[PDB]
Amino acid sequence: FTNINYYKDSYAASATRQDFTQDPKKFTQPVLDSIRELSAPLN
Amino acid sequence: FTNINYYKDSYAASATRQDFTQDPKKFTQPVLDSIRELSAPLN
Amino acid sequence: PECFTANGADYRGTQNWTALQGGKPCLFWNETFQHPYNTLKYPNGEGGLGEHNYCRNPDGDVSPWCYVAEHEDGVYWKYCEIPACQMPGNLGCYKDHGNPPPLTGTSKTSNKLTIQTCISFCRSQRFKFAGMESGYACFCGNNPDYWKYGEAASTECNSVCFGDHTQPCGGDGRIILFDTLVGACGGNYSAMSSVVYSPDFPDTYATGRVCYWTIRVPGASHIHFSFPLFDIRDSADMVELLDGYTHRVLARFHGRSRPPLSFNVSLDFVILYFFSDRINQAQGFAVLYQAVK
Amino acid sequence: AESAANTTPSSHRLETGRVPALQAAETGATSNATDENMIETRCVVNRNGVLETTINHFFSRSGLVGVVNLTDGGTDTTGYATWDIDIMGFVQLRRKCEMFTYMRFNAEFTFVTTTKNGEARPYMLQYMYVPPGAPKPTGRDAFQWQTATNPSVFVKLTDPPAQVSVPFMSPASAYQWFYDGYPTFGQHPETSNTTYGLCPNNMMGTFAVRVVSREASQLKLQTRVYMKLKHVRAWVPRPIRSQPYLLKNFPNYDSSKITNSARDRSSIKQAN
Amino acid sequence: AESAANTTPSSHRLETGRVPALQAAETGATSNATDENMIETRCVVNRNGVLETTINHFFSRSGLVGVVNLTDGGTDTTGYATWDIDIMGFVQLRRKCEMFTYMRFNAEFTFVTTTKNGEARPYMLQYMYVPPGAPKPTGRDAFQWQTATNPSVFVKLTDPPAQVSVPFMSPASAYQWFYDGYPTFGQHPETSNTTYGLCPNNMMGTFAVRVVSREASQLKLQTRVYMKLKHVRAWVPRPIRSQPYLLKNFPNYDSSKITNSARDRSSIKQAN
Amino acid sequence: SDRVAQLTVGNSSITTQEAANIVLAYGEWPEYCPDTDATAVDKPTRPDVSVNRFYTLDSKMWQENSTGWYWKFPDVLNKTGVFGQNAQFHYLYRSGFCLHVQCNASKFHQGALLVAVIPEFVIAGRGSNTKPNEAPHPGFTTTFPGTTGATFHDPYVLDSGVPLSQALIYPHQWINLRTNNCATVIVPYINAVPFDSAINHSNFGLIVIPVSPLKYSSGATTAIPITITIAPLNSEFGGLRQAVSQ
Amino acid sequence: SDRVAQLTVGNSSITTQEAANIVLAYGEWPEYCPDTDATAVDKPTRPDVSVNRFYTLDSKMWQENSTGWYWKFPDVLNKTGVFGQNAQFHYLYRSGFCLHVQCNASKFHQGALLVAVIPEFVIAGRGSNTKPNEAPHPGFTTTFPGTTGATFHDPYVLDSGVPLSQALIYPHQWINLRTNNCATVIVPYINAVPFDSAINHSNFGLIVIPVSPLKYSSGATTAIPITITIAPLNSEFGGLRQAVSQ
Amino acid sequence: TLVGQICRYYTQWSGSLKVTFMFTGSFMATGKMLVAYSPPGSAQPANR
Ligand SMILES: *[C@@H]1O[C@H](CO)[C@@H](O)[C@H](O)[C@H]1NC(C)=O
Ligand SMILES: *[C@@H]1O[C@H](CO)[C@@H](O)[C@H](O)[C@H]1NC(C)=O
């Protein structure tokens, strides 16, 4: 399964397990004051 | 046995286990009143 | 010029080959009892059918075609690539590859797309060349280089249109070129010898079409006219020949009048009149002229 | 149900009210008259299997699907050879497949390439799968043959035939060879409906092949496609066609010269 | 997150104070207006996958990287063929790779060698990887081809294409295709800065190839390099280039004859 | 206790005296689209009264030289009433149907009819031309007959190349003039997509074909019509926009 | 926290920046007809999406010599969309409405508008004739203006003999160009019968009357339109029959 | 846009979109607009 490598090195293997860690708020909302969803952005 | 696949995908395997679920009354007797075996179909 | 129609319906030639370079011969039109097109059911012409094997178009197809000998490979009929079969205003077919198109301009897609709708779409925006491909396309442009991908064969670009099923709308990845001058109403014509079509020529002409074709030449002696195509079956619509110096009428053609094939006028300010009707519309005209210097 | 059916011992009846042989066919149902409610039977245990008659064992045959030519001339050559992937070209797999309305399966395409007169020289080929929306390669040295973000297979002629697994890739939930409808909107003509019955959710791109070289190769190859079905599910069984096929993507038949479903006999009162 | 997103049932609101559709864009943030704080939606559970859109599945394509010629003549021959390893030569993998600032990955170089007119004769080749600082071989029978303390691969033309795994070998922590700086010190000219933007931590040696023989071989080979990325990590995403590439190792564009990012329309008040 | 029936849907009712049992297609009742199989986001509308009732079409006289008739059900009642009005404004559609075909005669007439539904009943063109330019294709009134209906030309091959003898695999019912005078088939929503346009795609089609000819002695009645009623059970609509015609 | 608002109904949304609080007419929300107050027997239909959304009418330029405009709400959106199509097929009707009138300008313009609903807003004829044969009566486009609207002749007496000064007893709201640029009134179903025809009877009518004239200096913008949107909250329909026009 | 190029890399897309408009006029300039989306069917609407 998944074609494990037969070598002493670790970079000669295939793609390892996937990682679904998106964390998209670092690009869409890069602000300090947490803007609420139902509110005005400016008071 | 049965030639299990060596891949990450699931559609690249061979035929899986068989399934003998016929259920042939959906085509032969598609009626609402269950007609008994020893009776007249119309009264 | 031998074909004055968008599909080559009026082609009377003697080319008994499918192509002049690397082709297979065409079968005779009397040795074809197997197929529903032969002279045994269509005598006295009917598209042109005698005792020959010429590339005709009796079935209203997009291009002339003949019967090829079946070599147990399926196809029993091939399109005949006629080099001298192009209406004046048809530049030819060219190839279409990618992000740089042959015609740099506006595009339009439609579920009904004939030749004249795309020509009018490109003409209403003041473009010089029209173009369409794969049946649903309208590529306008003004660039002088539309052969940047190469010229393709005319048999390759015979995909059918969508609004009409007797016109070739190019092909998949192959654009067919047209001028925006054909099928319009009027134009300051000052060339040596051009052609004048009726409004909406590839389609039928609309109801209430009236326009003015002005013919001016820089000092020719006299002009020579000709009428290759003429098909009007109504007594209301009519073509006229006018003089613009003192506004006198030279000739009055009608649907019930058979016009001469050629005549002469010793003038250089010829005006063309065309009053349409609202009851019956069948086909336009393909007036070809020539000025004698 | 690993076997067919068993028969229980029966006997004779002499009494009124029970009529198993009078199943009315006006109800749209199938007669449920068994052997035990009829002529006196015996006790037999049946060990005949019903495994071969399943759909998965009925559609796991390869069959021929497409034939692609490759002339590769010198002055009027093309180089490439595209072939749109459709199975309605050869009436055997089509007749076997068109007895259902909705199907869903996976494919095991196999490519067998030979020469014109018959010979296997070690020329390397390149099979390319162009999905719908990707540009088609124009030329034997075109830009599209880089196969970046595009699956391709490199194999020679002397090698065994290639074999790739294709998943279920329809945008809908299942396939269908019968679409009683129209793909677009608006007004539809009455003379020639070339758009009626056009299956929208069936186009699967175009298959392409060329020869990896520099100048040319004076050879005329001819590759054949064999598609095996697997993991197949069928819905809404349809009657099997009894007329000869006439067109590629349109079910038509000859109005005159109709073929009967059975052959002719001398008389109706004669079994031979 | 193995699937995309689910929608909760929504309803209408008639009240003051809550405005979800007035997200100010002056703040540099993206509007967080969902469907449930808007037009009335239903309850749908989405099972569409997000596995294919990951970086590891987006960069695991081979693509073409380099083309190396080998003339091997008789009187003006060279014998060897060096090729500096860089991926900014073919705009497809470069355009796909230059949408990030810092990357780090491993490589799976594959070498496909053919003949000029197209033929596979059993000639043995020798592929050599010369790291930066090792001497380059000069001649088809040079001293450097001994491959002592130097990795090399011996393969024929009839064999399947070779495939070796290359690790991450940059002296820094990650790769970068954009170096806004200068490699040296001192005074820099104003007329022609041929040293600006020169990526210092990107040179990876030179790839070499010859034919193992004694006298010569009247053949013109042409090998192609296909580099597959794996174990890739990307940082600082950059916008995708919209101008045609003009130079090998310098991002330039034509000042005149600029290409717009979109095509032209007839009017602004018309969607077609 | 079984040859009588009263089908009531909405504000309509159908009474009968000579009937067989109702036929339920494929053993599945028409039900609303479950949230697992759905793919749209906008909330669908459910009138539940004005679009769920028995719409009666016209009657067709069954002569001796009759061949048969067929309809397209999401197209027949597409211009008549609240169902049609609701189907012209929306883009998505999903519903089941209840069928009822009336054909009564005396006890001296003879003949038998075959009423059945055919999912994806595509009409075949009739001709022996393989050229793409002359290959015959059916017109719009042949593919989509409307509320009137269309006749058969070769009902032996179902006008589709498929034999009529094998058409008993579909949900069918017979009208034998010595046994009953009506036939009832309930059919659920059969499609490979959850919702679909009710204008550019007919799901299935009803077909009435007299296999046994109508015969009677001189002196009896001579007008034998075929009447059909349709009930759109469990209608749903979505994608509200401007009303389109076709 | 109060001058901003986002009203979302169905697939529509209305965002604003300068708003007062919403006006709820008579303190009653639009609700469905209870079974105690109902009198019909047939089950009513409830689309709940396709007829419950913000329909935007046309805009009208507000000049200096403007007098005002008025509409009839179960008549304006009576031919446009699924609400109109559903209202032409049915005989009974019951719904509430959400209102929104847009009028923005710069901080240099001045003027004020009065938007209010008038239940049973009957138009009065203008004349001094008491004979039945010459007594002036309003036309159909004056009583039922349609989706376009009608103008006032004597907006001081509301074109009904009733003074405008006392028209503040109705559910009203002001549009003062120095304070806000929109006005919102939610109105329930007000009638003396549970259900009623949406074609032969308008329940109430919106009215926009500029009491303070529009004034600005030479150099500013001169096109000041009035835009209105309508949301039919809690629609019900009954008595399904053929579609009528008017 | 960036999402347009990302969707041009792939061949099939799903999910909802967002279009955010932004007014860059003066402070004293006011007004109202109607942004409207319409599913397929007929052509672009003629009037509001
Ligand atoms: C075509 O016609 C010409 C007569 O002009 C004749 O000489 C020639 O042999 C013909 N060729 C074929 C293939 O029929
Ligand atoms: C067809 O016409 C050609 C030209 O005259 C002739 O040679 C040939 O014999 C004809 N064929 C038949 C069957 O008459």
Ligand SMILES: *[C@@H]1O[C@H](CO)[C@@H](O)[C@H](O)[C@H]1NC(C)=O
């Ligand atoms: C017109 O003039 C040309 C030469 O000027 C002559 O050849 C031709 O026959 C003339 N046409 C007629 C109809 O006289």
